[PDB]
Ligand binder design. Structure first.
Ligand SMILES: C[C@H](CCC(=O)O)C(=O)O
Ligand SMILES: C[C@H](CCC(=O)O)C(=O)O
Ligand SMILES: [Zn+2]
Ligand SMILES: [Zn+2]
Ligand SMILES: [Zn+2]
Ligand SMILES: [Zn+2]
Lengths: 331, 327
């Protein structure tokens, strides 16, 4: 009946329009508490995030999934404050992203499983806030540690029913190795979203995973450095493909019969310290609408291409509800 | 006249017997808060650290310098709790160690200088606790980022007078490159402790540094895997040299005229999550005295070798006071 948020359980019906891959703040563990002035101030970051979430809410968003892990500087107390003030539901994540510290990198698959279970079953830190999704990452072929993370995520998912979502190098077809490892642990593809899949134009790679039951995370639609060609750091981060090109992958998967496997998001954030210093300012200049980009820009774009509104509502409301609803625990 | 501790400012005379390179808990940023069960529980880690610090206090220790940085999982609230319950002063550190996250690795020398200054001049996190030392690290030739960290540490030291202490690969003579970079920033060697220097047996490396005015950190005296030869991970971390061999480097530098530039410590910890899982139990099994090892074992070892008590008081009381006092 219920999904865990940073404010407690909500019914599946209350989730509504859901962005399945977002960040309040992309940072590092302990960084926001040790150096809040990097973001101007903690209060400034809160105000910026609350305004951004209110803008998404006015455009119809009711829930976001914050896929920031421990090592991406997830601060669940910040998410809770920002969720309350904006009245947008936020689902928090466990797992590990691309910057685990030594204290994570040295751990066994059994130990990592216990850590992920702790954040789902007991709570994150001392807040009692329970994670509602598990996030994992590869950047090409998995390192041995990344394999352990994938297996621990699958084991925690099976034990708790909460879904798994991933970071990929889509152009290296990362989803295929991730799928192989998840299936070796007996995880159902319908409980796995292969994320950053709009970073590639290889439809055959995406449709092969979708045909296997995997969810395809088309989650970075406004990520584009067009017009920023002189900015090496922004170009490397955001790529030189247009948001229209990324958005047309949504239509392509619909046209090929895979609507039920699509999830869409912005992969936006309101603070960003794990990259070059000016990057949040640059991104905000590109996409002032922030997390409202999906409802304000992608939906009207696809509507005029002929995608029916009921199909778009199914992708943005029903598909995330099915994904986030916990399934039965194993045993 | 004042040194910043996790309980506030203290005067120089209050420091007393001081261990200049120690850790309450060797971890990673955010880890103790996110996964306290790794240590049994936060309360169990507190109780273990308080018992261990009380044992060091009974052996004569009055102050320790916790050289855990942000990325070594420094939790200054934990330091404060344990300091208060064992009545041992704890000086906290800023700087960066060998595991900086992306949000640190991407920063400029100017940005890093601002961060180090913040923890010294303003306070750590939202606690108001101010750092009294800057910790830096190399493992062989400095990476480009480590060069930035060394320069930012020099700039923060020059602006505040707080000293700099280093992690080295002593057997690659890292202190020479660290000194070169510090001096290129105009930092005085008397503000710098070249640490882990007991990891090497090359006396000529240490005496040349000391003849340039650097302090020499013989800070890992009880680190030894003798008797643990079937344990690859403990052997790799602790080395196969005896504590006596490390302790004899103290006597050698005294015999060569450098008693006023020696700093001695244990480099012990009460929790340890940044290595293999069993490592803290292993270390405790060979050194139950923990941080009391220096006063309970090294001081009698040197006294039998003929070092007068005045010299040992100078090394354990006078040198740390001079080093930590802001200049
Ligand atoms: C902006 C954003 C946050 C992190 C992520 O999705 O890997 C990104 O993709 O870098
Ligand atoms: C025991 C200790 C803590 C970290 C350090 O001093 O680099 C160590 O030396 O590993
Ligand atoms: Zn990602
Ligand atoms: Zn993301
Ligand atoms: Zn060290
Ligand atoms: Zn140390």
């Amino acid at each position: 009946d219920r999904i865990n948020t940073v404010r407690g359980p909500i019914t599946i019906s209350e989730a509504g329009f859901t962005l399945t891959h977002e960040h309040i703040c992309g940072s590092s563990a302990g960084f926001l508490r040790a150096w809040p002035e990097f973001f101007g101030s903690r209060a400034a970051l809160v105000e910026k995030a609350v305004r951004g979430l209110r803008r998404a809410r006015a455009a119809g968003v009711r829930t976001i999934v914050d896929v920031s892990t421990f090592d991406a500087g997830r601060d669940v107390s910040l998410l809770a404050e920002v969720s309350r003030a904006a009245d947008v539901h936020i689902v928090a994540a466990t797992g590990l992203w691309e910057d685990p510290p030594l204290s994570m990198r040295l751990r066994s698959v059994e130990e990592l499983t216990q850590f992920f279970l702790r954040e789902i079953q007991y709570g994150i830190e001392d807040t009692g806030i329970r994670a509602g999704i598990i996030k994992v990452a590869t950047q090409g072929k998995a390192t041995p540690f990344q394999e352990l993370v994938l297996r621990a995520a699958a084991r925690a998912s099976l034990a708790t029913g909460v879904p798994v979502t991933t970071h990929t190098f889509a152009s290296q077809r990362d989803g295929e190795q991730q799928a192989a490892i998840f299936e070796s642990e007996g995880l159902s593809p319908s409980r796995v979203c292969i994320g950053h899949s709009d970073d590639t134009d290889d439809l055959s790679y995406l449709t092969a995973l979708a045909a296997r039951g995997y969810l395809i995370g088309l989650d970075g639609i406004p990520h584009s450095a067009i017009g920023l060609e002189d900015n090496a750091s922004a170009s490397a981060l955001l790529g030189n493909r247009s948001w229209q090109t990324r958005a047309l992958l949504i239509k392509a998967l619909i046209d090929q019969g895979y609507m039920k496997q699509i999830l869409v998001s912005n992969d936006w954030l309101f603070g960003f310290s794990s990259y070059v210093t000016n990057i949040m300012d640059v991104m905000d200049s590109v996409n002032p609408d922030g997390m409202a980009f999906i409802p304000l820009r992608v939906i009207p774009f696809l509507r005029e291409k002929g995608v029916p509104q009921e199909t778009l509502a199914g992708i943005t409301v029903t598909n995330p509800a099915r994904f986030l609803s916990p399934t039965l625990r194993a045993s």
